[PDB]
Amino acid sequence: MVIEDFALNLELFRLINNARHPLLDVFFTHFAYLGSGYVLFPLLIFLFIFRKEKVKPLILAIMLETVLVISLKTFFNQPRPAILLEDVNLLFPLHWRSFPSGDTAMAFTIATVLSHGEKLHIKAILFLYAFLIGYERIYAGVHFPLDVFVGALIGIICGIISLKY
């Protein structure tokens, strides 16, 4: 069962993965680090200093999304675009566990928990960051639009669930 092989998913991927430029390649390569788990420890330390009330919600939300993301990654074991499709523009050598996008889920988890109760321009900054991570995964050729949409969905839900608890 390959859930990534429907017309809307493949046509959307081609539109993003083919609209390229060397400056986009550099920007998204530099930007990808902000969607990895390597920002979590630096971020949590700064939260502990300036926004300690957000530390516990973010930790619980990241735990929720991480468990949910690795579970779906293991059960579905979907191929990434470099395996399913031909002539994929690849920025990172990733091939498997496509569904869903963990970087997108974490980024939307960060944006959901940290936007709560904050000024409007802070919400726009965080959710533009989350959007660019999701766009970066498709531009890098390592994810399908289905992976980043569900990943974003997981991140938003787990962030909201954590804020309520």
Numbering used by the authors: 1 to 165
The authors write:
LpxE is a member of the lipid phosphatase/phosphotransferase (LPT) family, a well-distributed family of lipid-processing enzymes also known as the integral transmembrane branch of the type II phosphatidic acid phosphatase (PAP2) superfamily. This family is characterized by a conserved tripartite active site motif of KX6RP---PSGH---SRX5HX3D and activity independent of Mg2+ or other cations. Removal of the lipid A 1-phosphate by the membrane-embedded phosphatase LpxE strongly protects bacteria against host cationic peptides and the last-resort antibiotic colistin, significantly dampens the host innate immune response, and dramatically increases colonization and survival of Helicobacter pylori in the gastric mucosa. In order to gain molecular insights into the structure and function of the lipid A 1-phosphatase LpxE, we identified the previously uncharacterized gene aq_1706 from Aquifex aeolicus as the gene for the thermophilic LpxE enzyme (LpxEAA).
The selenomethionine substitution of the nonconserved I63 residue (I63M) was designed to enhance the selenium single anomalous dispersion (Se-SAD) signal for de novo phasing. The overall structure of LpxEAA contains seven α-helices, including an N-terminal amphiphilic helix lying at the periplasmic surface of the inner membrane and five tightly packed transmembrane helices (α3 to α7). Apart from α2, which originates from the periplasmic surface and penetrates halfway across the inner membrane at an ∼45° angle and immediately connects to transmembrane helix α3, the remaining helices are oriented largely in parallel or antiparallel with each other and perpendicularly to the membrane plane. The catalytically important H143 is located 3.3 Å away from the sulfur atom of the sulfate group, ready to carry out inline attack to remove the phosphate group of the lipid substrate. D147, the last residue of the R137X5H143X3D147 motif, forms a hydrogen bond with H143. The first three residues of the PSGH motif are conserved in LpxEAA, with the central serine residue (S101) serving as a helix cap to stabilize helix α5, but the histidine residue is replaced with an aspartate residue in LpxEAA.
